[PDB]
mmCIF file of C-alpha atoms in Angstrom:
data_model
loop_
_atom_site.group_PDB
_atom_site.id
_atom_site.type_symbol
_atom_site.label_atom_id
_atom_site.label_comp_id
_atom_site.label_asym_id
_atom_site.label_seq_id
_atom_site.Cartn_x
_atom_site.Cartn_y
_atom_site.Cartn_z
ATOM 1 C CA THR A 1 -16.677 -22.186 15.289
ATOM 2 C CA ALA A 2 -15.249 -18.982 13.764
ATOM 3 C CA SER A 3 -16.259 -16.000 15.877
ATOM 4 C CA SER A 4 -15.199 -12.903 13.908
ATOM 5 C CA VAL A 5 -15.295 -11.472 10.396
ATOM 6 C CA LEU A 6 -12.638 -9.488 8.563
ATOM 7 C CA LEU A 7 -13.339 -5.882 7.625
ATOM 8 C CA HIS A 8 -11.670 -4.444 4.518
ATOM 9 C CA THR A 9 -9.200 -2.678 6.823
ATOM 10 C CA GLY A 10 -7.960 -6.031 8.125
ATOM 11 C CA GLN A 11 -9.691 -5.613 11.472
ATOM 12 C CA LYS A 12 -11.253 -8.626 13.123
ATOM 13 C CA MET A 13 -14.751 -7.694 14.227
ATOM 14 C CA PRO A 14 -16.358 -10.214 16.624
ATOM 15 C CA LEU A 15 -19.630 -11.727 15.366
ATOM 16 C CA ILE A 16 -21.236 -11.079 18.764
ATOM 17 C CA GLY A 17 -21.110 -7.732 20.538
ATOM 18 C CA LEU A 18 -22.936 -6.224 23.481
ATOM 19 C CA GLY A 19 -25.642 -3.733 22.571
ATOM 20 C CA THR A 20 -25.832 -0.739 24.931
ATOM 21 C CA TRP A 21 -28.872 0.742 23.200
ATOM 22 C CA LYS A 22 -31.491 1.462 25.930
ATOM 23 C CA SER A 23 -29.090 0.602 28.764
ATOM 24 C CA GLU A 24 -29.663 3.250 31.440
ATOM 25 C CA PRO A 25 -26.542 4.963 32.848
ATOM 26 C CA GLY A 26 -27.257 3.364 36.235
ATOM 27 C CA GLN A 27 -27.338 -0.187 34.810
ATOM 28 C CA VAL A 28 -24.837 -0.176 31.967
ATOM 29 C CA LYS A 29 -21.673 -0.594 34.070
ATOM 30 C CA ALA A 30 -22.864 -3.925 35.472
ATOM 31 C CA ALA A 31 -23.830 -5.068 31.969
ATOM 32 C CA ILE A 32 -20.343 -4.268 30.626
ATOM 33 C CA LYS A 33 -18.706 -6.137 33.513
ATOM 34 C CA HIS A 34 -20.844 -9.212 32.908
ATOM 35 C CA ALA A 35 -20.225 -9.112 29.146
ATOM 36 C CA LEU A 36 -16.456 -8.843 29.503
ATOM 37 C CA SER A 37 -16.509 -11.757 31.986
ATOM 38 C CA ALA A 38 -18.572 -13.803 29.510
ATOM 39 C CA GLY A 39 -15.948 -13.218 26.818
ATOM 40 C CA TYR A 40 -17.450 -10.323 24.866
ATOM 41 C CA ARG A 41 -14.782 -8.349 23.038
ATOM 42 C CA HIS A 42 -17.107 -6.078 21.037
ATOM 43 C CA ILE A 43 -19.194 -3.297 22.577
ATOM 44 C CA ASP A 44 -21.647 -1.213 20.546
ATOM 45 C CA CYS A 45 -22.239 2.349 21.745
ATOM 46 C CA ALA A 46 -23.768 5.640 20.597
ATOM 47 C CA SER A 47 -23.746 9.191 21.895
ATOM 48 C CA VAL A 48 -27.549 9.286 21.714
ATOM 49 C CA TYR A 49 -27.832 6.373 24.156
ATOM 50 C CA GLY A 50 -26.840 8.886 26.854
ATOM 51 C CA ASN A 51 -24.575 6.444 28.679
ATOM 52 C CA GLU A 52 -21.085 6.731 27.163
ATOM 53 C CA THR A 53 -19.585 8.332 30.291
ATOM 54 C CA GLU A 54 -20.680 5.338 32.367
ATOM 55 C CA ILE A 55 -19.458 2.914 29.703
ATOM 56 C CA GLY A 56 -16.089 4.708 29.796
ATOM 57 C CA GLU A 57 -15.856 4.164 33.544
ATOM 58 C CA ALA A 58 -16.759 0.495 33.226
ATOM 59 C CA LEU A 59 -14.197 -0.132 30.491
ATOM 60 C CA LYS A 60 -11.476 1.690 32.412
ATOM 61 C CA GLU A 61 -11.738 -0.929 35.173
ATOM 62 C CA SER A 62 -10.675 -3.872 33.019
ATOM 63 C CA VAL A 63 -9.542 -2.591 29.615
ATOM 64 C CA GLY A 64 -6.150 -1.066 28.840
ATOM 65 C CA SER A 65 -2.562 -1.006 30.040
ATOM 66 C CA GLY A 66 -1.754 -3.711 32.572
ATOM 67 C CA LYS A 67 -5.396 -4.763 32.665
ATOM 68 C CA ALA A 68 -7.249 -8.020 32.039
ATOM 69 C CA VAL A 69 -8.228 -6.990 28.508
ATOM 70 C CA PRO A 70 -5.639 -5.066 26.461
ATOM 71 C CA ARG A 71 -7.178 -2.165 24.498
ATOM 72 C CA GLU A 72 -6.217 -3.797 21.186
ATOM 73 C CA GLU A 73 -8.292 -6.864 22.093
ATOM 74 C CA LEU A 74 -11.529 -4.880 22.400
ATOM 75 C CA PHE A 75 -13.641 -3.661 19.465
ATOM 76 C CA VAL A 76 -15.551 -0.465 20.340
ATOM 77 C CA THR A 77 -18.144 1.094 18.023
ATOM 78 C CA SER A 78 -19.896 4.428 18.460
ATOM 79 C CA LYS A 79 -22.182 6.523 16.281
ATOM 80 C CA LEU A 80 -22.555 10.142 15.133
ATOM 81 C CA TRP A 81 -26.013 11.441 16.085
ATOM 82 C CA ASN A 82 -28.477 13.152 13.683
ATOM 83 C CA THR A 83 -27.942 16.653 15.105
ATOM 84 C CA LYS A 84 -24.214 16.499 14.351
ATOM 85 C CA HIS A 85 -24.222 16.093 10.568
ATOM 86 C CA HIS A 86 -22.813 19.564 9.811
ATOM 87 C CA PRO A 87 -19.159 19.042 8.822
ATOM 88 C CA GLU A 88 -17.988 21.453 11.553
ATOM 89 C CA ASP A 89 -19.719 19.353 14.216
ATOM 90 C CA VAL A 90 -18.382 15.950 13.225
ATOM 91 C CA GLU A 91 -14.950 15.993 14.846
ATOM 92 C CA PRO A 92 -16.200 17.677 18.044
ATOM 93 C CA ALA A 93 -18.907 14.995 18.286
ATOM 94 C CA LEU A 94 -16.325 12.225 17.953
ATOM 95 C CA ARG A 95 -14.006 13.949 20.437
ATOM 96 C CA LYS A 96 -16.842 14.144 22.973
ATOM 97 C CA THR A 97 -17.486 10.421 22.501
ATOM 98 C CA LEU A 98 -13.774 9.655 22.998
ATOM 99 C CA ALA A 99 -13.681 11.809 26.138
ATOM 100 C CA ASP A 100 -16.730 10.088 27.583
ATOM 101 C CA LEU A 101 -15.516 6.567 26.694
ATOM 102 C CA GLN A 102 -12.021 7.523 27.899
ATOM 103 C CA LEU A 103 -10.458 6.128 24.725
ATOM 104 C CA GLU A 104 -7.777 7.222 22.242
ATOM 105 C CA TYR A 105 -9.628 5.792 19.266
ATOM 106 C CA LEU A 106 -12.701 3.924 18.162
ATOM 107 C CA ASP A 107 -12.588 0.711 16.188
ATOM 108 C CA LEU A 108 -15.655 1.770 14.204
ATOM 109 C CA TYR A 109 -17.643 5.000 13.930
ATOM 110 C CA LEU A 110 -21.027 5.018 12.195
ATOM 111 C CA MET A 111 -23.380 7.685 10.880
ATOM 112 C CA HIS A 112 -26.376 6.710 13.031
ATOM 113 C CA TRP A 113 -28.993 7.686 10.399
ATOM 114 C CA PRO A 114 -28.681 9.140 6.890
ATOM 115 C CA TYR A 115 -30.924 12.094 7.743
ATOM 116 C CA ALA A 116 -30.099 15.172 9.796
ATOM 117 C CA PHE A 117 -31.912 16.879 12.668
ATOM 118 C CA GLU A 118 -31.695 20.586 13.547
ATOM 119 C CA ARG A 119 -28.212 21.551 14.713
ATOM 120 C CA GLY A 120 -27.650 22.206 18.398
ATOM 121 C CA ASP A 121 -27.129 20.691 21.832
ATOM 122 C CA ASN A 122 -30.529 18.987 22.038
ATOM 123 C CA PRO A 123 -30.463 15.517 20.422
ATOM 124 C CA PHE A 124 -34.227 15.748 19.880
ATOM 125 C CA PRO A 125 -35.135 19.313 18.870
ATOM 126 C CA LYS A 126 -38.873 18.786 19.172
ATOM 127 C CA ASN A 127 -41.857 20.966 18.405
ATOM 128 C CA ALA A 128 -44.642 21.265 21.000
ATOM 129 C CA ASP A 129 -46.610 18.548 19.208
ATOM 130 C CA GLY A 130 -43.720 16.081 19.318
ATOM 131 C CA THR A 131 -42.331 16.209 15.788
ATOM 132 C CA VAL A 132 -38.583 16.744 15.372
ATOM 133 C CA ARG A 133 -37.162 19.701 13.466
ATOM 134 C CA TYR A 134 -34.957 18.711 10.532
ATOM 135 C CA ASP A 135 -31.713 19.918 8.957
ATOM 136 C CA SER A 136 -30.854 19.842 5.235
ATOM 137 C CA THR A 137 -27.230 18.637 5.464
ATOM 138 C CA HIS A 138 -26.598 15.818 3.001
ATOM 139 C CA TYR A 139 -24.971 12.606 4.224
ATOM 140 C CA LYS A 140 -22.301 12.941 1.507
ATOM 141 C CA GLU A 141 -21.084 16.145 3.134
ATOM 142 C CA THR A 142 -21.118 14.476 6.546
ATOM 143 C CA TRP A 143 -19.206 11.529 5.087
ATOM 144 C CA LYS A 144 -16.401 13.746 3.792
ATOM 145 C CA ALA A 145 -15.978 15.212 7.295
ATOM 146 C CA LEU A 146 -15.916 11.699 8.782
ATOM 147 C CA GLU A 147 -13.110 10.613 6.417
ATOM 148 C CA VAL A 148 -10.700 13.136 8.009
ATOM 149 C CA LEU A 149 -11.005 11.286 11.343
ATOM 150 C CA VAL A 150 -9.306 8.189 9.939
ATOM 151 C CA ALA A 151 -6.236 10.165 8.877
ATOM 152 C CA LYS A 152 -5.970 11.636 12.395
ATOM 153 C CA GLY A 153 -5.879 8.145 13.877
ATOM 154 C CA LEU A 154 -9.064 8.732 15.879
ATOM 155 C CA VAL A 155 -11.083 6.005 14.183
ATOM 156 C CA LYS A 156 -9.968 2.766 12.513
ATOM 157 C CA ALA A 157 -13.032 2.259 10.302
ATOM 158 C CA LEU A 158 -16.114 4.208 9.271
ATOM 159 C CA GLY A 159 -19.547 2.888 8.466
ATOM 160 C CA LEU A 160 -23.227 3.480 7.973
ATOM 161 C CA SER A 161 -26.314 2.824 10.051
ATOM 162 C CA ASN A 162 -29.865 2.662 8.692
ATOM 163 C CA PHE A 163 -28.821 3.450 5.111
ATOM 164 C CA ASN A 164 -30.587 1.858 2.165
ATOM 165 C CA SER A 165 -28.894 0.367 -0.909
ATOM 166 C CA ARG A 166 -29.211 3.525 -3.001
ATOM 167 C CA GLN A 167 -27.755 5.645 -0.191
ATOM 168 C CA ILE A 168 -24.866 3.224 0.324
ATOM 169 C CA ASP A 169 -23.979 3.418 -3.362
ATOM 170 C CA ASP A 170 -24.242 7.212 -3.206
ATOM 171 C CA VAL A 171 -21.658 7.277 -0.398
ATOM 172 C CA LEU A 172 -19.466 4.810 -2.309
ATOM 173 C CA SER A 173 -19.633 7.022 -5.403
ATOM 174 C CA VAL A 174 -17.736 9.824 -3.617
ATOM 175 C CA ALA A 175 -15.764 7.956 -0.946
ATOM 176 C CA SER A 176 -12.021 8.323 -0.427
ATOM 177 C CA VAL A 177 -12.330 6.164 2.682
ATOM 178 C CA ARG A 178 -14.726 3.266 2.073
ATOM 179 C CA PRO A 179 -17.429 2.370 4.611
ATOM 180 C CA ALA A 180 -16.591 -0.996 6.216
ATOM 181 C CA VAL A 181 -19.847 -1.882 7.955
ATOM 182 C CA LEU A 182 -23.601 -1.372 7.542
ATOM 183 C CA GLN A 183 -25.646 -1.641 10.746
ATOM 184 C CA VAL A 184 -29.408 -2.231 10.371
ATOM 185 C CA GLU A 185 -32.340 -3.986 12.033
ATOM 186 C CA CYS A 186 -32.156 -7.680 11.086
ATOM 187 C CA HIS A 187 -33.831 -10.900 12.254
ATOM 188 C CA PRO A 188 -35.853 -13.629 10.567
ATOM 189 C CA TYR A 189 -38.949 -11.411 10.049
ATOM 190 C CA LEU A 190 -36.753 -8.809 8.310
ATOM 191 C CA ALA A 191 -33.943 -10.945 6.941
ATOM 192 C CA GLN A 192 -32.378 -8.185 4.804
ATOM 193 C CA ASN A 193 -31.294 -10.721 2.198
ATOM 194 C CA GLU A 194 -31.319 -8.146 -0.585
ATOM 195 C CA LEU A 195 -29.453 -5.514 1.399
ATOM 196 C CA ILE A 196 -26.919 -8.041 2.772
ATOM 197 C CA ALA A 197 -26.239 -9.304 -0.746
ATOM 198 C CA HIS A 198 -25.820 -5.684 -1.818
ATOM 199 C CA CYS A 199 -23.325 -5.022 0.989
ATOM 200 C CA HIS A 200 -21.345 -8.169 0.272
ATOM 201 C CA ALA A 201 -21.059 -7.077 -3.379
ATOM 202 C CA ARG A 202 -19.678 -3.726 -2.142
ATOM 203 C CA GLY A 203 -17.246 -5.086 0.446
ATOM 204 C CA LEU A 204 -19.249 -4.052 3.523
ATOM 205 C CA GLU A 205 -19.907 -6.391 6.449
ATOM 206 C CA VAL A 206 -23.330 -6.253 8.078
ATOM 207 C CA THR A 207 -24.265 -5.800 11.743
ATOM 208 C CA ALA A 208 -27.768 -6.677 12.993
ATOM 209 C CA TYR A 209 -29.469 -4.801 15.799
ATOM 210 C CA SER A 210 -32.719 -6.138 17.238
ATOM 211 C CA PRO A 211 -31.660 -9.691 16.268
ATOM 212 C CA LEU A 212 -34.086 -11.161 18.813
ATOM 213 C CA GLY A 213 -37.088 -9.395 17.310
ATOM 214 C CA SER A 214 -37.693 -6.666 19.893
ATOM 215 C CA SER A 215 -40.100 -8.563 22.146
ATOM 216 C CA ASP A 216 -39.982 -5.474 24.371
ATOM 217 C CA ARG A 217 -41.947 -3.716 21.595
ATOM 218 C CA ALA A 218 -44.464 -6.525 21.022
ATOM 219 C CA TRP A 219 -47.133 -4.681 22.991
ATOM 220 C CA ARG A 220 -47.270 -2.050 20.223
ATOM 221 C CA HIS A 221 -48.997 -4.658 18.043
ATOM 222 C CA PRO A 222 -50.526 -7.108 20.536
ATOM 223 C CA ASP A 223 -52.021 -9.427 17.906
ATOM 224 C CA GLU A 224 -48.731 -9.946 16.030
ATOM 225 C CA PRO A 225 -46.731 -13.111 16.704
ATOM 226 C CA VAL A 226 -43.645 -12.993 18.920
ATOM 227 C CA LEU A 227 -40.491 -14.029 17.011
ATOM 228 C CA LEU A 228 -38.951 -15.850 19.986
ATOM 229 C CA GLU A 229 -42.132 -17.943 20.204
ATOM 230 C CA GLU A 230 -42.382 -18.934 16.523
ATOM 231 C CA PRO A 231 -43.048 -22.695 16.352
ATOM 232 C CA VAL A 232 -40.001 -23.304 14.142
ATOM 233 C CA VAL A 233 -37.791 -21.413 16.619
ATOM 234 C CA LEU A 234 -39.153 -23.457 19.519
ATOM 235 C CA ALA A 235 -38.638 -26.681 17.539
ATOM 236 C CA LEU A 236 -35.035 -25.766 16.714
ATOM 237 C CA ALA A 237 -34.457 -24.865 20.375
ATOM 238 C CA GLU A 238 -35.594 -28.333 21.447
ATOM 239 C CA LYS A 239 -33.731 -30.185 18.689
ATOM 240 C CA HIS A 240 -30.433 -28.449 19.517
ATOM 241 C CA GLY A 241 -30.903 -28.050 23.271
ATOM 242 C CA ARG A 242 -30.366 -24.305 22.989
ATOM 243 C CA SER A 243 -32.490 -21.279 23.897
ATOM 244 C CA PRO A 244 -34.726 -19.555 21.324
ATOM 245 C CA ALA A 245 -32.434 -16.495 21.556
ATOM 246 C CA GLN A 246 -29.454 -18.704 20.705
ATOM 247 C CA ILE A 247 -31.339 -20.094 17.709
ATOM 248 C CA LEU A 248 -31.951 -16.586 16.321
ATOM 249 C CA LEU A 249 -28.361 -15.531 16.913
ATOM 250 C CA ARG A 250 -26.847 -18.717 15.436
ATOM 251 C CA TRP A 251 -28.848 -18.161 12.248
ATOM 252 C CA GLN A 252 -27.128 -14.803 11.834
ATOM 253 C CA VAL A 253 -23.673 -16.159 12.792
ATOM 254 C CA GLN A 254 -23.955 -18.735 10.024
ATOM 255 C CA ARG A 255 -24.999 -16.004 7.571
ATOM 256 C CA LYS A 256 -21.823 -14.122 8.648
ATOM 257 C CA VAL A 257 -23.987 -11.331 10.028
ATOM 258 C CA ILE A 258 -22.581 -9.668 13.151
ATOM 259 C CA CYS A 259 -25.120 -9.379 16.002
ATOM 260 C CA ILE A 260 -25.324 -6.833 18.821
ATOM 261 C CA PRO A 261 -28.145 -7.986 21.113
ATOM 262 C CA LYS A 262 -28.858 -5.381 23.782
ATOM 263 C CA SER A 263 -29.261 -6.536 27.390
ATOM 264 C CA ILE A 264 -28.440 -5.743 30.994
ATOM 265 C CA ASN A 265 -29.490 -9.184 32.224
ATOM 266 C CA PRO A 266 -26.561 -11.368 33.319
ATOM 267 C CA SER A 267 -28.135 -14.686 32.271
ATOM 268 C CA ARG A 268 -29.150 -13.405 28.845
ATOM 269 C CA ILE A 269 -25.862 -11.607 28.254
ATOM 270 C CA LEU A 270 -24.068 -14.918 28.879
ATOM 271 C CA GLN A 271 -26.463 -16.973 26.743
ATOM 272 C CA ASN A 272 -26.219 -14.582 23.811
ATOM 273 C CA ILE A 273 -22.532 -15.251 23.131
ATOM 274 C CA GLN A 274 -22.799 -19.049 23.388
ATOM 275 C CA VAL A 275 -23.551 -19.518 19.682
ATOM 276 C CA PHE A 276 -20.365 -21.013 18.265
ATOM 277 C CA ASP A 277 -20.684 -24.642 19.351
ATOM 278 C CA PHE A 278 -23.664 -25.849 17.309
ATOM 279 C CA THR A 279 -24.580 -25.749 13.623
ATOM 280 C CA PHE A 280 -27.708 -25.542 11.454
ATOM 281 C CA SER A 281 -28.165 -27.752 8.389
ATOM 282 C CA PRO A 282 -29.094 -26.254 5.009
ATOM 283 C CA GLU A 283 -32.679 -27.453 5.622
ATOM 284 C CA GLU A 284 -32.833 -25.634 8.974
ATOM 285 C CA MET A 285 -31.476 -22.424 7.446
ATOM 286 C CA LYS A 286 -34.237 -22.660 4.824
ATOM 287 C CA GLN A 287 -36.865 -23.180 7.532
ATOM 288 C CA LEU A 288 -35.691 -20.005 9.262
ATOM 289 C CA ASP A 289 -35.771 -18.258 5.874
ATOM 290 C CA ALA A 290 -39.503 -18.995 5.670
ATOM 291 C CA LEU A 291 -40.174 -16.466 8.435
ATOM 292 C CA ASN A 292 -39.132 -13.517 6.245
ATOM 293 C CA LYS A 293 -42.091 -11.129 5.923
ATOM 294 C CA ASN A 294 -40.821 -7.533 5.756
ATOM 295 C CA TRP A 295 -41.808 -6.727 9.337
ATOM 296 C CA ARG A 296 -39.785 -3.758 10.604
ATOM 297 C CA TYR A 297 -39.909 -2.955 14.352
ATOM 298 C CA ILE A 298 -37.499 -0.033 14.492
ATOM 299 C CA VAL A 299 -39.085 2.975 12.785
ATOM 300 C CA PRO A 300 -39.403 6.320 14.553
ATOM 301 C CA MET A 301 -43.100 6.796 15.336
ATOM 302 C CA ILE A 302 -45.382 9.466 16.738
ATOM 303 C CA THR A 303 -48.934 9.452 18.064
ATOM 304 C CA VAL A 304 -51.484 11.345 15.969
ATOM 305 C CA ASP A 305 -55.103 11.242 17.172
ATOM 306 C CA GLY A 306 -54.664 7.988 19.073
ATOM 307 C CA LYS A 307 -52.711 6.175 16.369
ATOM 308 C CA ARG A 308 -48.981 5.617 15.858
ATOM 309 C CA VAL A 309 -47.710 6.733 12.435
ATOM 310 C CA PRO A 310 -44.170 7.047 11.054
ATOM 311 C CA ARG A 311 -42.560 10.331 12.135
ATOM 312 C CA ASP A 312 -39.709 10.786 9.695
ATOM 313 C CA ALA A 313 -40.980 9.377 6.389
ATOM 314 C CA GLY A 314 -41.232 12.876 4.901
ATOM 315 C CA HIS A 315 -37.550 13.668 5.398
ATOM 316 C CA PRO A 316 -35.856 13.834 1.994
ATOM 317 C CA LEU A 317 -33.140 11.463 3.211
ATOM 318 C CA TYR A 318 -35.389 8.914 4.938
ATOM 319 C CA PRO A 319 -34.120 5.386 4.223
ATOM 320 C CA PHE A 320 -37.276 3.255 4.446
ATOM 321 C CA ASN A 321 -39.277 4.399 1.407
ATOM 322 C CA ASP A 322 -37.261 2.225 -1.026
ATOM 323 C CA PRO A 323 -37.773 -1.566 -1.190
ATOM 324 C CA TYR A 324 -34.237 -2.069 0.221
#
């Protein structure tokens, strides 16, 4: 039944939050309204999603002084984008996020990726051919600049997104403020058991994006199976009288993995938080474990002579070259 986990700061972070990744500015306000009505108290944002101003307007309607949801009862996460890794750019980036969201502080602020892109006002400084120009700033230097934000009261907790185990330990080796959360892709095809175990041994909680297996990206590999249609998922759905999405989310809830499924659909937004009133047996958890196959959907790609290949795997700080 328990619906949050404790961060090392003492903060309660709800096990289900609303993902705003891919939510267009024109649609995100309705999504936020529906989520708040459905009982969501955790919203996951990022500057690069290009919709924080609209999210700020939506939250201002029902969150804060004298409003239905007091500010302290909402958990808001945002993320520092790849072009803002230079120490001088870190606080201005956070301040811009706070201005757009119309907030005094964030509950959690993440480094969106461990690797940096060329500094400037273009989030994707691309060459004519589509590649992105890189920057050499190390994530340890960016981390030190992030730590200052906690002392100023602007952010309650800091964390990491798309870091691997080696990179997490590297941050830990120099940290004066400890990361509280790792956010990565996670679902039964990419169960992240090794990386989750690693985080638990380091005191970090884990947040899963793409917990429903990115069926919106299925067309990229049309002969691959769809996670939501896996026979074991369908069988669990029938046994428990729950939707396949609820099966995939409950699996993570029971693993104590926070989930941030992205949606603007009112029926799916509602469904996605109704995961605290049924339970899987040890046998069922092991059946879901059988799906693990190291299939990663979320990798930046680029088309080269009619084929999609990884775009960023040559960056010195790329996270996906190690086993975990």
